[PDB]
Amino acid sequence: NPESADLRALAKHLYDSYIKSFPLTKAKARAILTGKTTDKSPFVIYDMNSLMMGEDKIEVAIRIFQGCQFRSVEAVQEITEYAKSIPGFVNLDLNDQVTLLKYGVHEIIYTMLASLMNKDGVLISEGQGFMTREFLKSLRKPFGDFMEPKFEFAVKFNALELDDSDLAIFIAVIILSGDRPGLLNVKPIEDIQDNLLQALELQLKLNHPESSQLFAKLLQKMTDLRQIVTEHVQLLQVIKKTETDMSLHPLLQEIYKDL
Amino acid sequence: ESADLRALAKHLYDSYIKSFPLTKAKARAILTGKSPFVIYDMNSLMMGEDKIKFKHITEVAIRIFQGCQFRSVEAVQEITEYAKSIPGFVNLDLNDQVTLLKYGVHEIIYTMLASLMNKDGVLISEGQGFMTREFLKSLRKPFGDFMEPKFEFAVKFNALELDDSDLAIFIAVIILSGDRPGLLNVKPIEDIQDNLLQALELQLKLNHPESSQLFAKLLQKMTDLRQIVTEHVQLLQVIKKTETPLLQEIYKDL
Numbered sequence: 095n096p097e098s099a100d101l102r103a104l105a106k107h108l109y110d111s112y113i114k115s116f117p118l119t120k121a122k123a124r125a126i127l128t129g130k131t132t133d134k135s136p137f138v139i140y141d142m143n144s145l146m147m148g149e150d151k152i153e154v155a156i157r158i159f160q161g162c163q164f165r166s167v168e169a170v171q172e173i174t175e176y177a178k179s180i181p182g183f184v185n186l187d188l189n190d191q192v193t194l195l196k197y198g199v200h201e202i203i204y205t206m207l208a209s210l211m212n213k214d215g216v217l218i219s220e221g222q223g224f225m226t227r228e229f230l231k232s233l234r235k236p237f238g239d240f241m242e243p244k245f246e247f248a249v250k251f252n253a254l255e256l257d258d259s260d261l262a263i264f265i266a267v268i269i270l271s272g273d274r275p276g277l278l279n280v281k282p283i284e285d286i287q288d289n290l291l292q293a294l295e296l297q298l299k300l301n302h303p304e305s306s307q308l309f310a311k312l313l314q315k316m317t318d319l320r321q322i323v324t325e326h327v328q329l330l331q332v333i334k335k336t337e338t339d340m341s342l343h344p345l346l347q348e349i350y351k352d353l
Numbered sequence: 354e355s356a357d358l359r360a361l362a363k364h365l366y367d368s369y370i371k372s373f374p375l376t377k378a379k380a381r382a383i384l385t386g387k388s389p390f391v392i393y394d395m396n397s398l399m400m401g402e403d404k405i406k407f408k409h410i411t412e413v414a415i416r417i418f419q420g421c422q423f424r425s426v427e428a429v430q431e432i433t434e435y436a437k438s439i440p441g442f443v444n445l446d447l448n449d450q451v452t453l454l455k456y457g458v459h460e461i462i463y464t465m466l467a468s469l470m471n472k473d474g475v476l477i478s479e480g481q482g483f484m485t486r487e488f489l490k491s492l493r494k495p496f497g498d499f500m501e502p503k504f505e506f507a508v509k510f511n512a513l514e515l516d517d518s519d520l521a522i523f524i525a526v527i528i529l530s531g532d533r534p535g536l537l538n539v540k541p542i543e544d545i546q547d548n549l550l551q552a553l554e555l556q557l558k559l560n561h562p563e564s565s566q567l568f569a570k571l572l573q574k575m576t577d578l579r580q581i582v583t584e585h586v587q588l589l590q591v592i593k594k595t596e597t598p599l600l601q602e603i604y605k606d607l
């Protein structure tokens with residue numbers, strides 16, 4: 095194990111800072127969704143009466159949507175915290191840091207949203223709740239189509255059966271993309287990712303020694319992420335016209351602006 | 354048992370060299386002779402941004418201030434990597450690691466900032482530049498009173514004439530402070546620090562035999578450090594009442 099030991103140390107570092115940056119890991123999500131407890135069982139929201147009942151322990155479609163955005167802002171904060179811990183990220187040009195976050199934040203958000211999802215719904219409110227897929231689809235349709243692409247991607251992506259130690263390196267690879275529009279110094283970004291991609295390859299080979307070409311399949315999923323992000327920005331462009339009274343968050347505004 | 358303390362001292366020094374590019378020996382060679390670009394007024398600041406490379410290059414006083422905090426973010430990552438090298442640190446509770454770092458990064462940032470400072474100014478941009486103390490004082494209020502406390506601390510601290518091998522163990526001692534608010538398991542933290550304090554005592558007695566109680570005086574500097582940190586966050590909230598997106602999330606601390 096020559097220089098593979100450096101990649102193992104990098105994997106462990108990213109995983110340690112992953113746990114320190116995201117309070118709801120995939121491990122805790124799967125322990126809740128399956129039923130490995132009686133204290134971690136979520137309250138299930140599936141209709142109007144179960145929503146009103148679940149509003150004790152933390153318009154209707156507007157309220158759910160605003161709740162989504164706030165969770166998204168919090169997620170951007172956590173991803174920012176995690177990004178600062180990627181070796182070399184804070185040593186890059188400041189403009190490039192803003193750019194990498196601006197275009198990577200949502201690909202990671204949907205990637206990690208898969209961890210909170212099954213084919214039937216998605217965990218909410220730090221895992222205290224669980225909103226069903228059909229209830230989200232039953233919302234008034236501009237809002238009813240917002241979560242279905244995330245659910246379809248999550249079904250296909252959860253089949254890879256990645257744990258948190260894999261996802262830490264994977265989302266690090268997403269942040270350090272040298273093909274982002276408007277980057278000033280691409281070469282250093284590509285060097286960091288070259289290291290992150292090596293680390294991810296080794297981690298997937300050791301953690302999934304039977305998953306043939308899991309590295310390639312995981313890399314191919316980034317295509318689906320792009321498509322998901324595109325459909326979302328279009329959907330937002332519809333909501334901005336239909337709902338002239340709803341407010342989009344400034345942080346979310348700066349991310350999607352001129353994307 | 355002293356051989357174990359010496360092994361810990363050498364280990365922490367090698368990790369210190371690996372983690373911090375601009376060491377105190379490097380900085381002091383620059384502050385004596387080896388050729389940094391000097392920033393002494395507004396015009397030399399303009400020419401500095403056009404010739405070197407920085408992190409403050411993106412009112413002038415507000416810009417200088419932000420470059421203090423960006424560098425602090427960069428510094429936090431270097432300090433984080435070094436802390437992970439302290440024996441026993443990674444085996445601690447994860448929440449305790451986050452807490453120790455959260456409350457230690459400031460004291461360490463100023464401790465090591467003293468290594469880049471003399472009575473006349475501070476090195477910047479990995480030693481490529483040197484911003485004068487007078488030009489920092491000439492900044493408009495409240496930004497002109499931001500760095501002067503750090504300079505006054507660095508003078509008294511540098512009078513101790515510590516080197517990198519001393520500062521490595523000293524920083525490690527700061528991290529393992531068992532009195533940080535919110536710690537869940539103080540016992541192993543204080544155990545590691547008890548070992549680090551022994552290593553620091555032996556190091557100072559072997560490296561500065563003419564200084565009788567240098568260990569005691571170095572410990573006395575921590576009160577001055579916590580005053581500098583405590584009084585720094587005050588000017589930081591007043592700074593939050595004088596500066597009104599995605600960039601502000603990157604610098605959510607410092």
Ligand SMILES: C#CCOc1ccc(/C=C2\SC(=S)NC2=O)cc1
Nearest residue numbers: 158159161162165218219220237240
């Ligand atoms: C249309 C639409 C979007 O659907 C969603 C999906 C997930 C959430 C997550 C929540 S809500 C809450 S409270 N805490 C969370 O994490 C909210 C709305």
Ligand SMILES: C#CCOc1ccc(/C=C2\SC(=S)NC2=O)cc1
Nearest residue numbers: 407408417418420421424477478499
């Ligand atoms: C009032 C005020 C703030 O004064 C300072 C002091 C030090 C720095 C450090 C820098 S800036 C750079 S680039 N590289 C460094 O190490 C920046 C601003």
